[PDB]
Amino acid sequence: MRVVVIGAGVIGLSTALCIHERYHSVLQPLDIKVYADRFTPLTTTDVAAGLWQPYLSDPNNPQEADWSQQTFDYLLSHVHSPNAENLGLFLISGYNLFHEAIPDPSWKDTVLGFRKLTPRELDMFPDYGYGWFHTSLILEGKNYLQWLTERLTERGVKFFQRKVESFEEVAREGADVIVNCTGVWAGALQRDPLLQPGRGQIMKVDAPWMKHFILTHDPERGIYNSPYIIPGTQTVTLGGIFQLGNWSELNNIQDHNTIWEGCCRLEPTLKNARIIGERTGFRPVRPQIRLEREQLRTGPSNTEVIHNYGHGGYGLTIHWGCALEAAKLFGRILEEKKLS
Amino acid sequence: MRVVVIGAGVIGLSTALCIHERYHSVLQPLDIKVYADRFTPLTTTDVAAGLWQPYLSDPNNPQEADWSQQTFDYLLSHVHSPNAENLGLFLISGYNLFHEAIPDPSWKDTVLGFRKLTPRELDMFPDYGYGWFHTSLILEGKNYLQWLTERLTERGVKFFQRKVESFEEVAREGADVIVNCTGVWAGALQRDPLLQPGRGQIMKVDAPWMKHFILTHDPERGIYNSPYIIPGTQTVTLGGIFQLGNWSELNNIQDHNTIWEGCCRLEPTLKNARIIGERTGFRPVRPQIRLEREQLRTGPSNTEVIHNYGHGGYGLTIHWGCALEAAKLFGRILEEKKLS
Ligand SMILES: Cc1cc2nc3c(=O)[nH]c(=O)nc-3n(C[C@H](O)[C@H](O)[C@H](O)COP(=O)(O)OP(=O)(O)OC[C@H]3O[C@@H](n4cnc5c(N)ncnc54)[C@H](O)[C@@H]3O)c2cc1C
Ligand SMILES: Cc1cc2nc3c(=O)[nH]c(=O)nc-3n(C[C@H](O)[C@H](O)[C@H](O)COP(=O)(O)OP(=O)(O)OC[C@H]3O[C@@H](n4cnc5c(N)ncnc54)[C@H](O)[C@@H]3O)c2cc1C
Ligand SMILES: O=c1[nH]cc(CCc2ccccc2)cc1O
Ligand SMILES: O=c1[nH]cc(CCc2ccccc2)cc1O
Question: Which residues touch A207 (CB under 8 Å, ≥6 apart)?
Answer without folding.
Answer: A231, A236, A269, A270, A273
